[PDB]
Write a protein that binds this DNA or RNA. Structure first.
Lengths: 86, 64, 125, 103, 201, 207
RNA sequence: UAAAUAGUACCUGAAAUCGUUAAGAUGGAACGGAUUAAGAGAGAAAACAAGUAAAGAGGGGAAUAUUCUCUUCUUUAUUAAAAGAAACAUCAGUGAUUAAUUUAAUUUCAAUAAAGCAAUCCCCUGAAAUUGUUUUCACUUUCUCCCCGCACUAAUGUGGGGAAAACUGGCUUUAUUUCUUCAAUUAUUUUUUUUGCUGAGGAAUUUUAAAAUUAUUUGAAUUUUUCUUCUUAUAAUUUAAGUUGUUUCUAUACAGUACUUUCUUAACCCACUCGUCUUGAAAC
RNA sequence: UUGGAUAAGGUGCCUAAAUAUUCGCUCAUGAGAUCCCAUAAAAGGUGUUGGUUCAUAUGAACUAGCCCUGAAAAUGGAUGGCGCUAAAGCGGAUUACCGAUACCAAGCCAUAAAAAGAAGAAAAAAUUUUUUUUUAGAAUCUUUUUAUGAGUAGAAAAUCGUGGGGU
RNA sequence: UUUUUGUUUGCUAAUGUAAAAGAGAAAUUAUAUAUGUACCGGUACAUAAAUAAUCCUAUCAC
């Protein structure tokens, strides 16, 4: 067949839906999800944030343990150096 | 092409056939340039060669 | 530089000249490939006398036609102009150089009544 | 008074160029009050007129213009590249161009 | 760059930076006139720069010194030679750029009555740390064989006196114009006065 | 009529197809296979009452009033002839700098905007296109100079379709003359020609 | 004499070399490549106008030396059309630019207004008592007070030594996030401003079919709807199925000051003397 | 060929792009300044900048950055030149930019390979009737597609010419 | 020296721009500070300290 212009399979909508029969459904779902009203998110941000207090505490604890382990390595190496100073 | 994408991304049962069916990609030069093709990506100085791990994605995007 | 006249692209004008033909009288400008050993032009040094190559070839859809979008056909008498009776739109005629004034006039009138254009219509008159 | 201008002055610097190599498909143009890439991006797509005089008349007029267009910026200091209908002659390097307000 | 001619007061500039800026302007096509070239500064001590100029003086075609590097001692000519070295003077365009430049010691008759400009990216006050040594081009030229420094100095003091008289007259005229304007600001219609006041006029 | 792939609503208008080419093998054919094209989609800052600056014609720098979007993309404009000498002119939008001032944002002038629109709703591009016969007559005179200039002027005046343009020009200018004149600074603004001073940088100033 | 620029070195009459005229260039070579510009020569075979009506010259073919028909030139008036270019617009391909954006993950923060906690104290952080765990003091601001120097400072303050609460800073409870904060990175998505370049091809049995979109239509599904999806049918479109339209100009010309082209000159960048032996030549 | 974006290398001027940003170091009365590359050592310094280990903020002893001495050649001379010291030097860092005959998209030429092939009306302009174009079919051919293209010695093919001979 | 028209046998009318589009801008100086004023370099007082990031100049025809 005669070679024609290679359409952009990403931005040319007709050829994109030709290549991916599910793309128009996926794109409509994403757009519809985008179109949700700001009131629900504004009123539920605190509800969706307050669930993570326990995760924040556990996260703080693991980073605290890591910092403490590093500091104890610091102290052990300093103690060994002071031992070998004499 | 979505089957092609799936098999490439998840190294699925048909990977050799899809990869061989696919012509080798001919990429553009990077949009912002390289750092130094001479030196490793893992060298402390700017460099490019070697395994970039996830950092290949931004380079591919600039080269596409 | 390329020149475009409608669909007609001439990939280059100012035809290629033989190396050193400018500064040697015994060297005529007709192109010769410099065989040479340290030959500059053959080695393709920058800034000197580039060589012809097939890449300059003109599009074969418009390869041989004249500025009037017609192929030239050279005729010596009235009998060589019969084929143009059904090619008048894509061929133009040119009278051969050694054709006398009567045959020239006859060719011009026959071409005019065949409505085939003539290139050198005003010669020897 | 008379002869409104409504164009921005520019100067024809050389060609698009490297050291010891030229690309006379683009011309480097400096615009009057622009010193930054961001400001030079403003006059992108505008038409450029290289208006110059001539020794003798050509259509009853002693003046002719080479038309071009700002294509993109060049460097960081508000120099642009312009593509003209025909390559402007190197005799014009340093001459004045008009970065017109249209389109 | 877009003026007919730029007059540059070379006092207090660094020679190389001034020459670079002037060279770029000339090549882009701007005519510049450099005045007070004897007050140009060079970084590095006077003795160090004098050694540099001695090295330059020791340079000549030994078969015929007339053909040799002409050395030139006027500080204006020293600036001109520096700019030429920053320039492609052996081409036609480079020669035009070079000849678009005029250099003076002091401020002669046309240029003493025009606005003098200054290049901030070439003042010593901005480009040299104070604790470092520099030299004055007029002094270097005098140590090298110019012997017109003091004459230029006294011409400059006379010019400064004339300029001070001019400035006093200009300041008085500006005050008179300001008073006339502030009286007239109450005679225009309140809409015009309001517009001028809003936009700072 | 339109299409809205990706939610765009490009808006289609019919297109004639007049260019003809030769077919590959036997015939000739009309090259354009499409019957509709998407329309102009003019600039957003283009309103009916906006005052604009003409950049190209013999009225460069003159200030004018937008009048109508002319169904082809070009817009009719009137620098009301009674105050400015700028006639009813069909100008391309991209040869025009539209300012941020609307004539109908003035208290006295906002009243008669509906009258303005009623007058303007009968301008059309055909009335702006030169008629073939008068063009022929005008070119006839080319086979002294002041006489031929005056004759060309007279032929244009006698064009049966410029007369309707002159009439609508006159009535719209009479409609807008008094209220414009009574805004003393604005009338001078409209009457004055825009120029580019060397203290104004156009990548920094607002239209 | 047809011809003497065929005049006895006599046909033609090249190049090197030289003369006349004209035009141009001309700062220690000249020439050149590539790109344009300015001049100067030429030029219409695409670089507008087919036909139509008239009168003048002609030429042919058919019709039984007489009717119709074809045609080429000259002039007039008498109308198209097409083509190139430019501008704008549309679409597509390919870039540049500037604004964003859905949903998640990652110890994020930071504010508002009412309480409270600790005071070298707090989120911290530091120094000390076969792994964890536990403990001590030492960590802050002051435009506070006191003492000494008591004006000593860089200071519109200051050095040294002490007391103070708690504005500042830290922590806890409640309500709020358009007073203010909502970051950064990554994954996953969706748009947007101004714009450069390009337009191959021309589909008599795939420029179809499908895809998308619009308008009706049947049923269903679901994220629940003014771009929700899936097909049922019809009709159209193009985002499919590689550029089309409008307006001008050339121009109502017959070759010019325009356009095409050759040449001559400049100008920016570049450019060493060819052939040859040679590892290696611009080679002293 | 037209656009785009880069490599190496650069962005004070010559010279297209930063007198960019950010942090240190260096003053040279012969500073220094891009692999190959266009020399520099042993040995020194109470120059300055950081480190280390001993001595009741002092004294030492080391260490290593830059700088200095050591460092003399014949025509006049070379970080390439100018010049540069709040660098245009030295060691980093962050960005933007400039920059190939390489890379990317598109067009065209040829080479190689491939898919395939031994007959019917299209349009336009005038006014149903005319007019203008075309209405193809050559097998070392026609249509379409993709990739590819340095080259001495050397080889081959296809083309271009000259004297003479048949047709 | 001023005005009008023009420069569309080698000659005897005759044109060139390296750069018009508002090509606008005269104080001096110091940079770990300056400048003006008034008295005797000193004293006192003002001013300036994104200084061109400014100011000045443009259209109101007849």
């Amino acid at each position: 067949k005669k070679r024609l212009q290679n359409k952009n399979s990403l931005t040319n909508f007709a050829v994109r839906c030709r290549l991916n029969p599910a793309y128009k459904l996926l794109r409509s779902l994403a757009v519809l999800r985008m179109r949700k009203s700001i009131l629900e998110k504004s009123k539920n941000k605190k509800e969706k944030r307050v669930q993570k207090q326990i995760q924040k505490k556990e996260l703080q604890k693991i980073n605290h343990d890591y910092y403490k382990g590093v500091a104890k390595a610091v102290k052990k190496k300093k103690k060994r150096e002071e031992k070998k100073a004499k | 092409i979505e089957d092609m994408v799936y098999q490439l991304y998840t190294c699925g049962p048909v990977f050799k056939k899809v990869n061989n069916f696919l012509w080798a990609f001919k990429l553009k030069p990077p949009r912002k340039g390289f750092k130094a093709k001479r030196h490793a990506f893992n060298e402390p100085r700017p460099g490019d060669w070697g395994n970039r791990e996830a950092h290949i994605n931004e380079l591919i995007n600039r080269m596409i | 530089a390329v020149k475009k006249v409608g669909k007609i692209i001439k990939k280059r004008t100012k035809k290629f000249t033989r190396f050193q033909s400018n500064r040697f009288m015994r060297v005529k400008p007709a192109w010769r490939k410099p065989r040479g050993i340290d030959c500059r032009v053959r080695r393709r040094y920058k800034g000197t006398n580039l060589m012809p190559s097939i890449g300059y070839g003109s599009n074969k859809k418009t390869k041989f036609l004249l500025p009037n979008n017609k192929y030239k056909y050279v005729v010596k008498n009235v009998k060589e102009m019969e084929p143009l009776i059904m090619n008048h739109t894509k061929y133009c005629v040119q009278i051969a150089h050694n054709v006398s004034s009567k045959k020239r006039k006859q060719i011009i009138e026959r071409a005019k009544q065949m409505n085939v254009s003539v290139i050198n219509a005003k010669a020897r008159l | 008074l008379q002869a409104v201008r409504l164009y921005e002055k520019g100067v024809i610097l050389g060609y698009k160029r490297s050291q010891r190599n030229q690309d006379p498909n683009f011309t480097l143009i400096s615009i009057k009050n622009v010193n930054t890439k961001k400001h030079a991006q403003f006059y992108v797509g505008k038409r450029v007129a290289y208006v110059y005089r001539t020794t003798k008349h050509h259509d009853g007029v002693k003046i002719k213009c080479i038309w071009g267009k700002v294509c993109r910026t060049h460097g960081n200091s508000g120099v642009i590249r312009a593509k003209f209908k025909t390559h402007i002659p190197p005799k014009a390097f340093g001459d004045r161009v008009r970065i017109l307000m249209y389109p | 760059m877009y003026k007919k001619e730029y007059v540059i007061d070379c006092k207090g500039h660094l020679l190389g930076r001034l020459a670079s800026l002037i060279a770029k302007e000339l090549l882009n096509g701007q005519r510049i006139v450099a005045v007070r070239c004897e007050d140009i500064n060079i970084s590095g001590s006077l003795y160090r720069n004098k050694l540099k100029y001695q090295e330059f003086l020791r340079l000549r075609t030994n078969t015929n010194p007339k053909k040799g590097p002409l050395h030139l001692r006027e500080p204006s000519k020293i600036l001109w030679r520096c700019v030429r070295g920053m320039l492609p003077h052996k081409t036609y365009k480079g020669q035009l750029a070079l000849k678009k430049l005029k250099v003076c010691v002091g401020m002669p008759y046309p240029y003493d009555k025009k606005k003098k400009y200054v290049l901030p990216s070439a003042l010593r006050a901005f480009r040299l740390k104070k604790h470092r040594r520099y030299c004055r081009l007029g002094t270097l030229s005098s140590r090298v064989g110019w012997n017109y420094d003091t004459l230029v100095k006294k011409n400059e003091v006379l010019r400064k006196q004339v300029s001070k008289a001019y400035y006093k007259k200009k300041v008085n005229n500006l005050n008179e114009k300001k008073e006339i304007k502030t009286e007239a600001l109450n005679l225009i219609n309140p809409e015009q006065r309001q517009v001028l006041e809003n936009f700072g006029y | 009529k339109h299409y809205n792939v990706k939610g765009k609503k490009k808006v289609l208008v019919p297109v004639n197809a007049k260019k003809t080419i030769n077919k590959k093998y036997f015939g000739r054919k009309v090259a354009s296979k499409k019957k509709y094209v998407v329309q102009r989609k003019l600039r957003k800052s283009i309103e009916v009452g906006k005052v604009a600056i003409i950049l190209t014609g013999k009225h460069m720098g003159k200030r004018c009033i937008i009048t109508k979007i002319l169904n082809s993309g070009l817009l009719a404009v009137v620098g009301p002839y009674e105050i400015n000498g700028v006639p009813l002119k069909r100008v391309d939008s991209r040869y025009l700098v539209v300012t941020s001032t609307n004539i109908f944002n003035f208290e006295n002038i906002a009243k008669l905007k509906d009258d303005f629109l009623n007058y303007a709703q009968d301008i059309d591009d055909d009335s702006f296109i030169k008629t073939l016969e008068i063009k022929k007559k005008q070119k006839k005179l080319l086979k002294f100079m002041n006489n031929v200039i005056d004759k060309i002027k007279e032929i244009r005046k006698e064009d049966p379709k410029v007369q309707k343009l002159e009439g609508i020009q006159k009535d719209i200018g009479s409609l807008l003359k008094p209220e414009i004149l009574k805004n003393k600074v604005f009338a001078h603004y409209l009457k004055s020609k825009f120029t580019l001073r060397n203290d104004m940088v156009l990548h920094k100033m607002k239209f």
